[PDB]
UniProtKB/Swiss-Prot annotation:
Keyword Repeat belongs to the record: yes
Name listed for the protein in its UniProt record: Frequenin-2
Tissue spec: In the embryo, highly expressed in the ventral ganglia.
GO biological process: chemical synaptic transmission; neuromuscular junction development; neurotransmitter secretion; regulation of neurotransmitter secretion; regulation of signal transduction; vesicle-mediated transport
Function summary: Plays a role in synaptic transmission and axon terminal morphology. Inhibits ric8a-mediated promotion of synapse number but does not affect ric8a-mediated neurotransmitter release.
Residues noted as binding Ca(2+) 1 in the record, renumbered to the chain: 67, 69, 71, 73, 78
Any one Gene Ontology cellular component term annotated for this protein: cytoplasm
Length: 169
């Protein structure tokens, strides 16, 4: 069930009110009786808004960011925290979240491949490499074929295309 200390934490750490959090919890438990949102279920959530294409790979990429302790489950607290950031975060928070989405192997850098990875995922859910390379080449200042968080942040606050594609701009 929903412990008071979970509520206390979430009402302090997120942009949701206690009432909203309780409303989300009833819905969360209805869909996930064990309190655990799995990758399978997360995909079916996306399949519900993108029946046209195949949002499997995009949803999987989003899943690993939601799942912050990497145990293969999104518990309710992980769910609310990620939802808070992506729907109500300030520009810096949404950028940082965006960065973690692109940084697939979580090494703190975005490579071209990883940027290809996401754009492909977006495509399957809904020349392309050339436009990406162009934007990546523009963001990569010291020309090392990596994008640090700072390179990605400043690049997006000048060319927000890579970020808006994630509906976070
Ligand atoms: C790259 N991503 C970053 C996060 N962004 N927002 C949150 C994702 N999210 C969602 C979140 C939790 C549970 C279910 C869903 S389903 C859903 C449907 C449409 C949208 Cl536009 C977003 C979502 C969508 C774009
Ligand atoms: Ca987890
Ligand atoms: Ca990486
Ligand atoms: Ca760089």
């Amino acid at each position: 069930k929903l412990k008071q200390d979970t509520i206390d934490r979430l009402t302090t750490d997120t942009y949701f009110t206690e009432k909203e959090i309780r409303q989300w919890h009833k819905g969360f438990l209805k869909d996930c009786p064990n309190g655990l949102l799995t990758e399978q279920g997360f995909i079916k959530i996306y399949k519900q808004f993108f029946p046209d294409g195949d949002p499997s790979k995009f949803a999987s990429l989003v899943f690993r960011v939601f799942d912050e302790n990497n145990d293969g489950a999104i518990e309710f607290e992980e769910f609310i925290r990620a939802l808070s950031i992506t729907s109500r975060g300030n520009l810096d928070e949404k950028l940082h979240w965006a960065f973690r989405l692109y940084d697939v192997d979580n090494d703190g850098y975005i490579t071209r491949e990883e940027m290809y990875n996401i754009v492909d995922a977006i495509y399957q859910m809904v020349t392309p490499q050339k436009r990406v390379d162009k934007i990546f080449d523009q963001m990569d200042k010291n020309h090392d074929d990596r994008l640090t968080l700072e390179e990605f942040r400043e690049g997006s606050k000048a060319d927000p295309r890579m970020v808006q594609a994630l509906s976070l701009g």
